[PDB]
Amino acid sequence: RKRVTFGEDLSPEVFDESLPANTPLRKGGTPVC
Amino acid sequence: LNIDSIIQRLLEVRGSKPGKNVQLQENEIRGLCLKSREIFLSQPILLELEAPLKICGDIHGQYYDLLRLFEYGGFPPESNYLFLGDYVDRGKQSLETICLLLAYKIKYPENFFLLRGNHECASINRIYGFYDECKRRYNIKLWKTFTDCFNCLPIAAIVDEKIFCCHGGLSPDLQSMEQIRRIMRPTDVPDQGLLCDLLWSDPDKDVLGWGENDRGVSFTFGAEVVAKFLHKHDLDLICRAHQVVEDGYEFFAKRQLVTLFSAPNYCGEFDNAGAMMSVDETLMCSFQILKPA
Ligand code: NA
């Protein structure tokens, strides 16, 4: 049966407000199953 | 209505210095409103969704941040999305924000979902920016067309019978989910009642049961109300938005409720990250944080 659980913390995607949306400063973590 | 062309034009600024406008034709925006409205009415007012999906909180017209969120989470249809409302007001580009979201709803109607926030209401967005933006860039008739569309948005979602999602929070009136289903659209947001509370209420650690909400609308609710609600409905989590939280997400009541707010550095006034909650096929929930340097 499916039940809510919480995954490990993921490092943030870091961005500069003055930079284009397609060039993040640091890639954040992405979840995997 | 050329949806692919509209999406391409909205996304052309992903590589631009932030702040550039996209000016669609007025008839195209009217078309987005009319077609999305038909889709919203064709789907339930209480959405029944399946994971995997990514859930986002307030955007408030911070269009470039929306583009950054999609860059991180995956642009539709790479990931399924549920947004919890508040697309307009406060930020500088409500129009681009809502146009992209409505365009994705039309393009991916079974994989992309938008709930109603308290700002998707004429009496609110008249004063907090959206009316002014519409009047300046287009006209008041367009604002009225958006209102007709917003009046048809769904107001809550349940994911895999376990996560209850809405913009604001719980209502003392909410005893049965059928009460949400019976709400007819189009509708404005009334000044009190079940629909109002779903868009407006807030959790509060100091409240016993239901209490005053100093927004001057709706209620606050305590941890015990959350626990009782989850147990009654065999749910595991409430996921809601509506309040700025420093880390982009914040738990309440021993992880029984989470608040998501997805507009980083809100209004240039707050010190917050944005977050979305990624829910995998097993209902394992992770937080993807978009953080300003
Ligand atoms: Na249900």
Residue numbers in the entry:
A (entry chain B): 390 to 422
B (entry chain A): 7 to 299
Give the authors' words.
While PP1 exhibits broad specificity, it acts in a highly specific manner by forming stable complexes, known as holoenzymes, with a host of regulatory proteins that direct PP1 activity towards specific substrates and localize PP1 to specific regions of the cell. During mitotic exit, PP1, in particular PP1γ (PP1 isoforms include PP1α, PP1β, PP1γ and PP1γ2; ≥ 85% identity between isoforms), is essential for histone dephosphorylation, nuclear-envelope reassembly and chromatin remodeling. These PP1γ-specific processes are mediated largely by the Ki-67:PP1γ and RepoMan:PP1γ holoenzymes.
The Ki-67/RepoMan residues C-terminal to the canonical RVxF motif are not present in any other PP1 regulator whose holoenzyme structure is known, suggesting these regulators bind PP1 using a novel mechanism. To identify this mechanism, we determined the crystal structures of the Ki-67496-536:PP1γ7–308 and RepoMan383-423:PP1γ7–308 holoenzymes complexes to 2.0 Å and 1.3 Å, respectively. As predicted by the ITC and NMR studies, Ki-67 and RepoMan bind PP1 using an identical mechanism. Namely, Ki-67 and RepoMan form a classical β-hairpin on the top of PP1 that extends from the PP1 RVxF binding pocket towards the PP1 N-terminus and then back again (~2600 Å of buried surface area). The structures also show that two established PP1-specific SLiMs—the RVxF-SLiM, 505RVSF508Ki-67/392RVTF395RM and the ΦΦ-SLiM, 515EL516Ki-67/402EV403RM —bind directly to PP1 in the RVxF and ΦΦ binding pockets. However, as predicted, the Ki-67/RepoMan residues C-terminal to these SLiMs (aa 517–535/404–422) also bind PP1 and do so in a manner never observed for any other PP1 regulator. Residues F517Ki-67/F404RM and P523Ki-67/A410RM are anchored to PP1γ via two hydrophobic pockets while multiple residues in Ki-67/RepoMan bind the side chains of R74PP1, Y78PP1 and Q294PP1 via polar and salt bridge interactions. This orders PP1γ L1, a loop that is generally more dynamic in most free PP1 and PP1 holoenzyme structures as evidenced by its higher B-factors and less well-defined electron density. Because these residues are critical for binding (removing them decreases the affinity ~five-fold), we termed this novel PP1 interaction SLiM the KiR-SLiM (Ki-67-RepoMan SLiM). All three residues, like the Aurora B targets S507Ki-67 and T394RM, are part of the PP1 interaction motif and their phosphorylation blocks the interaction with PP1, which, in turn, prevents the premature targeting of PP1 to chromatin.
